Motif scaffolding. Structure first.
Motif, PDB file in Angstrom:
ATOM      1  N   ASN C  36       4.592  -2.309  -4.229  1.00 33.54           N
ATOM      2  CA  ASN C  36       3.558  -2.997  -4.987  1.00 33.54           C
ATOM      3  C   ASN C  36       2.681  -3.836  -4.070  1.00 33.54           C
ATOM      4  O   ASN C  36       1.459  -3.907  -4.263  1.00 33.54           O
ATOM      5  N   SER C  37       3.291  -4.469  -3.068  1.00 32.50           N
ATOM      6  CA  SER C  37       2.527  -5.208  -2.070  1.00 32.50           C
ATOM      7  C   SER C  37       1.622  -4.281  -1.294  1.00 32.50           C
ATOM      8  O   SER C  37       0.470  -4.623  -0.997  1.00 32.50           O
ATOM      9  N   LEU C  38       2.103  -3.078  -1.013  1.00 30.32           N
ATOM     10  CA  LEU C  38       1.302  -2.119  -0.285  1.00 30.32           C
ATOM     11  C   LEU C  38       0.164  -1.609  -1.150  1.00 30.32           C
ATOM     12  O   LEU C  38      -0.944  -1.399  -0.658  1.00 30.32           O
ATOM     13  N   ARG C  39       0.407  -1.472  -2.453  1.00 29.31           N
ATOM     14  CA  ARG C  39      -0.642  -1.042  -3.372  1.00 29.31           C
ATOM     15  C   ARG C  39      -1.755  -2.070  -3.458  1.00 29.31           C
ATOM     16  O   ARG C  39      -2.943  -1.729  -3.367  1.00 29.31           O
ATOM     17  N   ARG C  40      -1.383  -3.339  -3.626  1.00 33.08           N
ATOM     18  CA  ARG C  40      -2.378  -4.403  -3.672  1.00 33.08           C
ATOM     19  C   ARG C  40      -3.127  -4.533  -2.357  1.00 33.08           C
ATOM     20  O   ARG C  40      -4.328  -4.823  -2.358  1.00 33.08           O
ATOM     21  N   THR C  41      -2.452  -4.288  -1.236  1.00 28.62           N
ATOM     22  CA  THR C  41      -3.124  -4.376   0.051  1.00 28.62           C
ATOM     23  C   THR C  41      -4.116  -3.242   0.239  1.00 28.62           C
ATOM     24  O   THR C  41      -5.233  -3.470   0.715  1.00 28.62           O
ATOM     25  N   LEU C  42      -3.728  -2.019  -0.133  1.00 25.33           N
ATOM     26  CA  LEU C  42      -4.654  -0.894  -0.060  1.00 25.33           C
ATOM     27  C   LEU C  42      -5.869  -1.110  -0.944  1.00 25.33           C
ATOM     28  O   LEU C  42      -7.000  -0.872  -0.513  1.00 25.33           O
ATOM     29  N   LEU C  43      -5.670  -1.608  -2.158  1.00 24.58           N
ATOM     30  CA  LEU C  43      -6.830  -1.764  -3.026  1.00 24.58           C
ATOM     31  C   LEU C  43      -7.682  -2.972  -2.680  1.00 24.58           C
ATOM     32  O   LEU C  43      -8.874  -2.981  -2.996  1.00 24.58           O
ATOM     33  N   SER C  44      -7.120  -3.993  -2.037  1.00 22.44           N
ATOM     34  CA  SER C  44      -7.876  -5.234  -1.984  1.00 22.44           C
ATOM     35  C   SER C  44      -7.860  -5.889  -0.613  1.00 22.44           C
ATOM     36  O   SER C  44      -8.010  -7.109  -0.515  1.00 22.44           O
ATOM     37  N   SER C  45      -7.699  -5.123   0.458  1.00 25.56           N
ATOM     38  CA  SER C  45      -7.774  -5.746   1.769  1.00 25.56           C
ATOM     39  C   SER C  45      -8.525  -4.952   2.821  1.00 25.56           C
ATOM     40  O   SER C  45      -8.679  -5.455   3.936  1.00 25.56           O
ATOM     41  N   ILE C  46      -8.997  -3.748   2.531  1.00 25.39           N
ATOM     42  CA  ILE C  46      -9.714  -2.939   3.507  1.00 25.39           C
ATOM     43  C   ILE C  46     -11.205  -3.218   3.348  1.00 25.39           C
ATOM     44  O   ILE C  46     -11.724  -3.077   2.234  1.00 25.39           O
ATOM     45  N   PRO C  47     -11.899  -3.642   4.394  1.00 24.33           N
ATOM     46  CA  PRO C  47     -13.331  -3.910   4.266  1.00 24.33           C
ATOM     47  C   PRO C  47     -14.114  -2.623   4.109  1.00 24.33           C
ATOM     48  O   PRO C  47     -13.673  -1.540   4.493  1.00 24.33           O
ATOM     49  N   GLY C 145     -12.280  -5.172  -1.569  1.00 23.99           N
ATOM     50  CA  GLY C 145     -11.675  -5.031  -2.882  1.00 23.99           C
ATOM     51  C   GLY C 145     -12.614  -4.416  -3.899  1.00 23.99           C
ATOM     52  O   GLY C 145     -13.350  -3.468  -3.617  1.00 23.99           O
ATOM     53  N   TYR C 146     -12.573  -4.959  -5.106  1.00 25.04           N
ATOM     54  CA  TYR C 146     -13.494  -4.602  -6.167  1.00 25.04           C
ATOM     55  C   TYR C 146     -14.061  -5.869  -6.770  1.00 25.04           C
ATOM     56  O   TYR C 146     -13.314  -6.775  -7.140  1.00 25.04           O
ATOM     57  N   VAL C 147     -15.378  -5.924  -6.878  1.00 24.44           N
ATOM     58  CA  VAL C 147     -16.032  -7.076  -7.480  1.00 24.44           C
ATOM     59  C   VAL C 147     -16.517  -6.593  -8.840  1.00 24.44           C
ATOM     60  O   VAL C 147     -16.682  -5.381  -9.030  1.00 24.44           O
ATOM     61  N   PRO C 148     -16.679  -7.455  -9.829  1.00 26.96           N
ATOM     62  CA  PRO C 148     -17.389  -7.025 -11.036  1.00 26.96           C
ATOM     63  C   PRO C 148     -18.877  -6.943 -10.802  1.00 26.96           C
ATOM     64  O   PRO C 148     -19.359  -7.205  -9.696  1.00 26.96           O
TER      65      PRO C 148
END
Ligand SMILES: [Mg+2]
Ligand SMILES: [Zn+2]
Lengths: 87, 83, 237, 690, 27, 55, 49, 580, 225
Positions: C36-47, C145-148
């Motif tokens: 789960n930590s890896l999932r959150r990192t993939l979705l929200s830490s790569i510029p 990440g993803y911004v609205p």
């Protein structure tokens, strides 16, 4: 039913017979014939020294010499490790 | 036909197996007699060669003979006559 | 102490960019600790870079349809929203696509300035009919990440500029699960299976490597309190 | 098991002779026999139990106390009436407004007429009133808090499963209870009671010597680690110290399931009522690993093994170490004269009592003869029947009780030496074991998770079990929910801040309930207990743990975090302390397997039951099921060469070992037995070829 | 109460029973 | 009603033909339903000649 | 009587709301209506009744 | 459990670890098994893999009590059963026990692998509805996953002028990212643009007309995110659903997907529905607290208004205007009216997200009367003889009953439980008799080739004049083979002789406007010993035509006397299982 | 775009429990990082506990000792509550003799070098004039939870009493986040984590070892190319 066929000693006994015929075939032919007739492994009739010396045409002391020589051969553990687990 | 790949007891799919034979009872006896042929091949291999032949597809590492039989059925490698 | 079994990492390449990593075996249960930590990192830490907002000629408040074209406004918007674009210049740079005459505008129509690039110029965006000229401006910056859809902090400093979403992350969809490999000899270890799907900016292998780098920094922050504390060492590779 | 009414027996009706009308509840049972508690098998109503207050008429009838009331003045003269005078007169209710003088308040009063009718008599004809509520109910059923909310089916299940708990090693008292935990423990017998008052002289783990006030002293011996009649522990540890003064009729030593005097059938566990990941699916229960680590649910089981050294026709048996062919490896645990040493841990199949019998003379097979000829080991005419510990059992050896003829002990005829070996193990709680609350909400253990993947509170405290929601509304047993909320209230402790008078809910509460301590014990009696407004009032103010943190709000729910993923759950979940038991349906008593074992005598089927190996009865309905599939070969298998084809079984086993094909099955044996029975009944039966 | 070394378990009982629970093994 | 069925069958000398379904369960042979009937129980299964030649 | 038996059993099972297809009941009723009675022997082997 | 598998497979593992030279012979191998030296487990995995076992559960009421599963090794000593066979086994987890058998021969393993496998037996034998259907918990989970909340976070609103719509999402991947951030709820109404899901028939005929093949095409839809995540479980060829997953809706979906697709697709789809259903059942927040059991606020007024009528009936009995029985009948009717009114006010009082009414209205479990007895009024409770007690119980189980009311409830509870026990014995005995009756109805020939056969009522005529569908067609018309043809108004043939007559051809017949079809049956199959195949029609288990070896008498007997037990009675016609 | 790498400050509350705060993080991440550290700390911190004991007067676990108030299994359940921190990895032994009346605290235990007992105030057993208790205790390093190793699996004698060991220095762990998440999209989490250790090692050292284990397992996924 404590006299019923246990169904694992029977297959152990058949495997005993197969391995025992193999080990007795590792020797020569007069030797294995003497052992099979001395212990009745061919008909269930245990032939003794005079019958064996008669059916081979020699003296009974020669039969006892061959018997002692082969039973000395069998007590060597190379002919015995495959039979030690069967007691 | 876009099914995800099966695994374990269910490979090959039985719905692709059933197109080969008439009913599933024929599929059962067909697979079982082929598996007994394969078992008699493995038992009668140490002595001289007799009429049995197989496994005609290449088996796995340690594979049960009935699975080899059913994969031969799915591979279209046999034929049969009913009674 | 010892890990008592070294875990591995191997991938099954499905398409060009959609992978499936497996990690085996772990200690029960580490699969949920790190998946789960890896999932959150993939979705929200790569510029990465995306479109922030657009503005368009001919449209001021009829936000339903654009004159001169076929496709309505929101279809143009959610075509532009799925647009892979790389950048280096951290300030919001502008890009222009502009085309007269009837035909199919593609992604290669746009003329990028220095540094920004498009990774799928053969992408359909819009159709024009009967001597129309479409001229939309893009506002492309980079982020994480993803911004609205960021609400316009100005009211009418750019009256045409309407905001959109920005899918910054080069990955798109990551899901994961665990298993129960070798319960008897190993006393019921685990097996993490990933399913990463990126856009064609970066490979999933490099995505997972960069995410591992950010995570190992983020836990090295917690390591650097008492460095000589005994932990679980996997050891050599 | 005492106080049990059983309508079957010699002179009584049997279950096939039992009609449906005797099993119902006639309205004369009220106060004479509990309508709830009855065994839920095929004995529903044939076996009951006496009421709490009931008392036996000298002619063998069941009298019942009543408070007689004269002219609308409720007196205290308690008059026992049997069911005839219960029909003559008229009977009021104990939850009626008595106006502190014996006077009723409202004229229109509930009452019972002769034929079970319920009316509103004016309050002048009432000549008897009940002695209390909970009069109708049994002993065990009156130990269920919030019983009046539960449906009678699940209350019946709860009363029949509250008698099946096992004595844990710790035995912590329940938070929420009734009155019937103290009285029905000191009257149960298994608690040592100080006979006459005085001071303590000497305590130990084994005896207590009291000093009576007049000279005399008396040693109360304990019972440590005695085996019960169902294999469970029966420890008695003292609860008094060396300088304490005791009075007569005081608890002095807790029993198996007791704790400071009162009953403790289980532990107090933090529960939550969400459905989590399908492991609590359809009555299944998950647990923390904390219950396995801290030995919360852990019962000591003690098993009795027994062998006798008897006489025989050939000679006499002998308990000795000279056993036959057996490596001096397994003869390490055994002492110098047979039996094992105290404390040596055994496993399944080990030797407990070296005991060897004579055999006689049987001629050998020639291969065995030549093996004895090669290795020189003799014939060894004695034959070994040692006491082996049976399959799937282990544990330590507590005690070895040995008898003998040489000590002139009472032994039956033809027996020389008796010995019993007590084996004991310490079972952890494990998946599959049967747990239940006090409300009939049984359920096996689905999965013992680790402590980190368990939904923990905002305070980092994990929950301990997780029940399912879908079993609650359709079984009509929200007594477990009321117990859950009141258990959280008693765990955290409340304080009704009566600053400006008393709040409206808390007016008719007793005193010293306006505030309470953490882990303070409470009790609701059965038919006069916590009202729902009072539960909302207690749950409103439920003073914080260590920080300023009211974890459970006024609704009774809390914001759980997911231990596994990490996100908070989007909706608040009910938590609290529920009192659950460990039932005696453990997995280790149930799991069984057989490849080839003992065989029956006359017919040649495999035998039956876990005491032997035995197989499961592939009965008639299963034969129908496999016919309906059309599986013909498997039916031929299961009815010939797994059960009765006597020459076929050994061929099957041999062919499996040699890796050949399974041979073709022959005729079953029970058909041939049928054939000879039909030929014995003078019926010419013959098989015809063509 | 009426049992000397009892634990202090507070009751919610609104009523009062005149008669005690009898000698439960009298039967 | 095994006694009365048995005694009047014994009088009638009523020979069973074993063609039913409980009887083959009783006497242990193969039942005539599913994989027991001779349309499926007598299947000849040989390797096909093309894969035989390729083998 | 075939229509009557099928309707009369399925009335009960629909009253409990249990979906049973009629061919099962038809299999059973077909076993019920096999035999015929002998009111006249003719002159061959058949006892009346 | 491995401690059990090691004793089931003991000759297999004995042979195998002789073969790997871990033992000199068979006897040392047996002693090595009995001491459990830890490489026996590594051998045990190899001897287990691809070798099925049977799982009996007594009492085996019907054909699916024995199924064949592939085993796998599990820590512990309890057999782990998959949850989607609980409905076939009738197995709750209150402590039920199941017997593991072991097929040996090649014929036995093939029969277990091909006929008795779990994933090959989805439907009933009786009515062909699925029993792998996801019930209970799972169903709730899916319900909360596909329900739609108006006024939820992140909806699609088309409001403009000041800002655009903020509802569109270019992909479900972006939708999932905006759901992990706290912007999108799962259950809000948005407009996604899908590229991997097949649109419904009207939108497919609109946007593509004839041949929209989905893996490339793109099409927009106003749905919720939950329905997109739900339709990703179902296969690619299946159209978009976009409803709220009631249990009947899931039954219809699995029945369609089992009737049109192969079996392995049905098994994988059912497994995916199980996983998604559990994972969203945890998040649904269905709890039970006494703050969530709301009482109806108008209850005291309703009880007073019917208490006055009870008082007047009692007064008219006391003044001799009517006898003893008629006042009982009047009170029974008044308190039935009271029960109905209390239940109606309770139904209109609750919200929709109250979990007790959510479990019920999803269709997961429990009827509404159990909610009425949790909160509101218990109502009339029966006599030990069977009549109604005229008092009646006026307290819910939330308020807590009084002593006499609870004592009245005990009558009906113990009566029902004892009646359940005796019926079972009777239902199993009825099945035992029927099996011996129809033991000789096995399918012998492919075709009797008669022309006789019954007629079917099949959507009787309306008085105004339409074709109102007969409600009991699925038990009386489907899975049957016509002997005659369908012709109307001297028109063309519609359905020819000998067709399976499923749902689309029934729809074609009711569209063309006929009411009676002459269809074959196993009543008039003219074969000698047992039925032919085409008179028996479609086998309800496969979905295809019945085979030429089936023992359809046994399937018939089991499906009739299988669902007994639960077959109460009523309030001098016999009206239950003794009537049957 | 925020280009500020996150930090870690510390907040001591008592000797054994303290709060750690990490800020700023990416949004939608704080709960996940907190659960990762919780599942690491509460499961896999190496510690030490007693493994097996040997009372002289007993032969097994299910017995009594002459003199003491409690019995042997209650002594087991009390010694299972001890806390002890070793230094070296070999199994060392510590002893306990007590004669005469009085409560037996854990402070009566004489340990060898390296090991220490972090709570002398534990009631273990209580004695009288006839009482005599004499026991050795085997202490061993390790991690996680282990059940009691078998007497037959080891080569141990009849005097051996195996006890379950719980090698866990941590006692209770929670967290909470404070997501700012302003409308200007400069959003960041704030992980306020909380650790209570059971006075064996300090919470700083427990968190440091957890960080070391996580750095080791995420060097697995990092080191690819
Ligand atoms: Mg059950
Ligand atoms: Zn026909």
């Amino acid at each position: 039913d404590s006299e019923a066929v246990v169904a694992v000693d029977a297959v152990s006994f058949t495997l005993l017979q197969d391995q025992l015929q193999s080990v007795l075939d590792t020797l020569s032919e007069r030797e294995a014939g003497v052992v099979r007739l001395r212990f009745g492994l061919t008909d269930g009739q245990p032939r003794t020294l005079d019958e064996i010396g008669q059916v081979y045409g020699v003296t009974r002391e020669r039969i006892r010499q061959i018997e002692s020589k082969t039973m000395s051969k069998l007590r060597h553990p190379s002919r015995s490790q495959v039979l030690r687990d069967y007691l | 036909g876009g099914y995800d790949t099966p695994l374990g007891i269910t490979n090959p799919p039985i719905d692709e197996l059933l197109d080969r034979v008439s009913s599933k009872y024929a599929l059962v006896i067909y697979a079982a007699k082929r598996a007994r042929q394969i078992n008699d091949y493995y038992n009668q291999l140490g002595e001289g060669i007799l009429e049995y032949v197989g496994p005609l597809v290449e088996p796995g590492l340690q594979e049960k003979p009935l699975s080899i039989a059913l994969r031969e059925i799915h591979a279209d490698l046999l034929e049969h006559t009913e009674g | 102490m010892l890990i008592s079994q070294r875990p591995t990492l191997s991938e099954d390449v499905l398409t060009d960019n959609r992978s499936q990593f497996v990690i085996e075996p772990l200690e029960p249960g580490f699969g949920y600790t790190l998946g789960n930590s890896l999932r959150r990192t993939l979705l929200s830490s790569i510029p990465g870079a995306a479109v922030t907002s657009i503005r368009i000629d001919g449209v001021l408040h009829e936000f339903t349809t654009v004159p001169g074209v076929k496709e309505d406004v929101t279809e143009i918007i959610l075509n532009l929203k799925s647009l892979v674009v790389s950048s280096e210049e951290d300030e919001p740079v502008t890009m222009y696509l502009r085309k007269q005459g009837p035909g199919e505008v593609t992604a290669g129509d746009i003329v990028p300035p220095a540094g920004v690039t498009v990774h799928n110029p053969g992408m359909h965006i819009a159709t024009l009919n009967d001597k129309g000229k479409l001229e939309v401006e893009l506002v492309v910056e980079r982020g994480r990440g993803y911004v609205p859809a960021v609400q316009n902090r100005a009211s009418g400093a750019e009256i045409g500029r309407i905001p959109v979403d920005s899918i910054y992350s080069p990955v798109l969809k990551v899901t994961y699960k665990v298993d129960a490999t070798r319960v008897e000899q190993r006393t019921d270890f685990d097996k993490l299976i990933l399913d990463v799907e990126t856009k064609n900016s970066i490979s999933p292998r490099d995505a997972l490597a960069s995410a591992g780098k950010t995570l190992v920094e983020l836990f090295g922050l917690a390591r650097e309190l008492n460095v000589e504390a005994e932990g679980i060492e996997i050891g050599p590779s | 098991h005492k106080r049990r009414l059983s309508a079957l027996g010699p002179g009584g009706l049997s279950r096939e002779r039992a009609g449906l009308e005797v099993r119902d509840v006639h309205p004369s049972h009220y106060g004479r026999m509990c309508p709830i508690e009855t065994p839920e098998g095929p004995n529903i109503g044939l076996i009951g139990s006496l009421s709490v207050y009931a008392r036996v008429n000298p002619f063998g009838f069941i009298e019942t106390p009543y408070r007689k009331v004269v002219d609308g003045v409720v007196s205290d003269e308690i008059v026992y009436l049997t069911a005839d005078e219960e029909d003559r007169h008229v009977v009021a209710q104990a939850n009626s407004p008595i106006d502190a003088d014996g006077r009723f308040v409202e004229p229109r009063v509930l009452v019972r007429r002769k034929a079970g009718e319920v009316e509103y008599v004016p309050s002048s004809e009432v000549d008897y009133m009940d002695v209390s509520p909970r009069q109708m109910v049994s002993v065990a059923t009156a130990m269920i808090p919030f019983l009046e909310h539960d449906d009678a089916n699940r209350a019946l299940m709860g009363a029949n499963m509250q008698r099946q708990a096992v004595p844990l090693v710790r035995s912590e008292a329940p938070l929420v209870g009734t009155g019937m935990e103290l009285r029905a423990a000191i009257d149960a017998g298994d608690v040592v009671v100080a006979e006459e008052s005085g001071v303590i002289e000497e305590v130990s783990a084994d005896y207590i010597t009291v000093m009576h006030d007049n000279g005399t002293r008396r040693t109360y011996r304990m019972r440590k680690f005695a085996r019960s009649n169902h294999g469970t522990c029966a420890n008695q540890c003292p609860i008094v110290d060396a300088g304490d003064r005791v009075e007569a009729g005081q608890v002095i030593a807790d029993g198996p399931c007791t704790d400071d005097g009162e009953m403790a059938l289980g532990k107090n566990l933090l529960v939550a009522i969400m459905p989590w990941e399908g492991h609590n699916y359809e009555d299944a229960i998950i647990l923390s690993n904390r219950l396995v680590e801290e030995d919360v649910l852990t019962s000591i089981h003690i098993e009795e093994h027994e062998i006798d050294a008897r006489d025989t026709k050939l000679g006499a048996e002998e308990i000795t170490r000279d056993i036959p062919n057996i490596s001096d490896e397994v003869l390490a645990d055994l002492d110098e004269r047979g039996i094992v040493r105290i404390g040596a841990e055994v496993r399944d199949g080990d030797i407990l009592v070296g005991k060897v019998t004579p055999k006689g003379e049987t001629e050998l097979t020639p291969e065995e003869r030549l093996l004895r000829a090669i290795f020189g080991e003799k014939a060894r005419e004695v034959r070994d029947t040692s006491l082996k510990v049976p399959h799937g059992e282990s544990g330590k050896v507590i005690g070895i009780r040995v008898f003998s003829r040489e000590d002139e002990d009472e032994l039956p005829a033809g027996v020389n030496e008796l010995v019993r070996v007590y084996v004991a193990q310490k079972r952890k709680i494990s998946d599959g074991d049967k747990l239940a609350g006090r409300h009939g909400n049984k359920g096996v253990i689905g999965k013992i998770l680790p402590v980190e993947d368990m939904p923990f509170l905002a305070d980092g405290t994990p929950v301990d079990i997780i029940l399912n929601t879908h079993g609650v509304p359709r079984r009509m047993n929200i007594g477990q929910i009321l117990e859950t909320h009141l258990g959280w209230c008693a765990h955290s402790g409340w304080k009704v801040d009566a600053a400006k008078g008393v709040p409206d809910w808390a007016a008719r509460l007793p005193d010293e309930l306006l505030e309470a301590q953490p882990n303070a014990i409470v009790s609701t009696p059965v038919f006069d207990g916590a009202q729902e407004a009072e539960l909302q009032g207690l749950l409103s103010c439920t003073l914080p743990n260590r920080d300023g943190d009211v974890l459970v709000d006024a609704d009774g729910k809390a914001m759980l975090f997911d231990g596994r993923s990490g996100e908070p759950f989007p909706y608040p979940v009910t938590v609290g302390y529920m009192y659950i038991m460990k039932l005696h349906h453990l997995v280790d008593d149930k799991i069984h397997a057989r490849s080839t074992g003992p065989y029956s005598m006359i017919t040649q089927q495999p035998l039956g039951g876990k005491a032997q190996f035995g197989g499961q009865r592939f009965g008639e309905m299963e034969c129908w099921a496999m016919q309906a599939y059309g599986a013909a070969y498997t039916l031929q298998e299961l009815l010939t060469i797994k059960s009765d084809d006597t020459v076929g079984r050994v061929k099957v086993y041999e062919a499996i070992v040699k890796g050949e094909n399974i041979p073709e099955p022959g005729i079953p044996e029970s058909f041939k037995v049928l054939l000879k029975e039909l030929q014995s009944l003078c019926l010419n039966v013959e098989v015809l070829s063509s | 109460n009426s049992v000397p070394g009892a634990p202090n378990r507070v009751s919610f009982a609104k009523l009062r029973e005149p008669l005690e629970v009898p000698g439960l093994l009298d039967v | 009603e095994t006694t009365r069925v048995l005694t009047d069958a014994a009088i009638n000398c009523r020979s069973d033909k074993l063609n039913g379904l409980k009887e083959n369960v009783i006497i242990g042979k193969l039942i005539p339903a599913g994989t027991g009937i001779n349309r499926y129980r007598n299947i000849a299964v040989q390797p096909t000649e093309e894969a035989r030649a390729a083998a | 009587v075939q229509i009557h038996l099928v309707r009369e059993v399925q009335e009960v099972y629909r009253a409990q709301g249990v979906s049973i297809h009629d061919k099962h009941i038809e299999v059973i009723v077909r076993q019920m209506l096999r035999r015929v009675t002998i009111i006249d022997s003719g002159s061959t082997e058949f006892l009346p009744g | 459990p491995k401690l059990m598998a090691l004793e089931l497979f003991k000759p297999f593992v004995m042979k195998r670890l002789v073969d790997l030279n871990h033992a000199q012979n068979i006897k040392s191998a047996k002693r090595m098994v009995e001491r459990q030296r830890p490489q026996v487990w590594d051998v045990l995995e190899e001897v287990i893999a691809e070798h099925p076992v049977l799982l009996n559960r007594a009492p085996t009421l019907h054909r699916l009590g024995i199924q064949a599963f592939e085993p796998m090794l599990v820590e512990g000593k309890a057999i782990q059963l998959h949850p989607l066979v609980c409905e076939a086994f009738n197995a709750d987890f209150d402590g039920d026990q199941m017997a593991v058998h072991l097929p040996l021969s090649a014929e036995a393993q093939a029969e277990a692998r091909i006929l008795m496998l779990s994933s090959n037996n989805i439907l009933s034998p009786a009515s062909g509805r699925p029993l792998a259907m996801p019930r209970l918990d799972m169903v709730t989970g899916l319900y909360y996953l596909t329900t739609e909340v108006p006024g939820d976070t992140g909806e699609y609103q088309p409001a403009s002028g000041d800002h655009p719509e903020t509802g569109v999402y270019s992909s479900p991947a972006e939708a999932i990212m905006a759901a992990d951030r706290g912007v999108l709820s799962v259950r809000a109404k948005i407009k996604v643009r899908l590229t991997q899901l097949r649109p419904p028939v009207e939108i497919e005929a609109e946007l593509f007309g004839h041949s929209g093949w989905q893996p490339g095409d793109a099409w927009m839809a106003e749905t919720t995110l939950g329905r997109v995540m739900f339709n990703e479980l179902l296969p690619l060829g299946y159209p978009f659903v976009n409803k709220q997953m009631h249990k009947k809706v899931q039954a219809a979906i699995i029945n369609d997907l089992a009737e049109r697709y192969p079996m392995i697709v049905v098994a994988q789809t059912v497994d995916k529905l199980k996983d998604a259903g559990f994972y969203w059942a945890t998040r649904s927040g269905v709890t039970v607290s006494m703050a969530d059991v709301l009482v109806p606020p108008r209850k005291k007024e309703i009880l007073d208004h019917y208490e006055e009528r009870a008082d007047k009936v009692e007064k008219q009995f006391q003044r001799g205007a009517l006898n003893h029985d008629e006042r009982n009948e009047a009170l029974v009717e008044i308190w039935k009216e009271a029960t109905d009114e209390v239940g109606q006010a309770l139904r209109e009082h609750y919200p929709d997200d109250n979990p007790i009414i959510t479990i019920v209205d999803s269709g997961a479990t429990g009827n509404f009367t159990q909610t009425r007895t949790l909160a509101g009024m218990k109502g009339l409770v029966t006599n030990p003889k069977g009549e109604f007690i005229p008092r009646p119980v006026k307290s819910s189980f939330r308020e807590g009953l009084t002593v006499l009311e609870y004592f009245i409830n005990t009558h009906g509870a113990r009566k029902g439980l004892a009646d359940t026990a005796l019926r079972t014995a009777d239902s199993g005995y009825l099945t035992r008799r029927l099996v011996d009756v129809s033991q000789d109805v096995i399918v012998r020939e492919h075709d009797c080739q008669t022309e006789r056969g019954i007629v079917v009522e099949l959507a009787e005529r309306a008085p105004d004049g339409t074709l109102i569908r007969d409600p009991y067609i699925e038990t009386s018309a489907y899975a049957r083979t016509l002997g005659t043809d369908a012709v109307d108004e001297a028109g063309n043939v519609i359905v020819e002789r000998g067709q399976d007559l499923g749902d689309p051809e029934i729809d074609a017949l009711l569209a063309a406007g006929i009411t009676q079809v002459k269809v074959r049956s196993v009543l008039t199959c003219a074969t000698s010993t047992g039925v032919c195949a085409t008179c028996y029609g479609r086998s309800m288990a496969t979905g295809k035509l019945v085979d030429i070896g089936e023992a359809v008498g046994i399937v018939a007997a089991q499906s009739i006397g299988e669902p007994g037990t639960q077959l109460t009675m009523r309030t001098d016609i016999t009206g239950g299982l003794p009537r049957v």
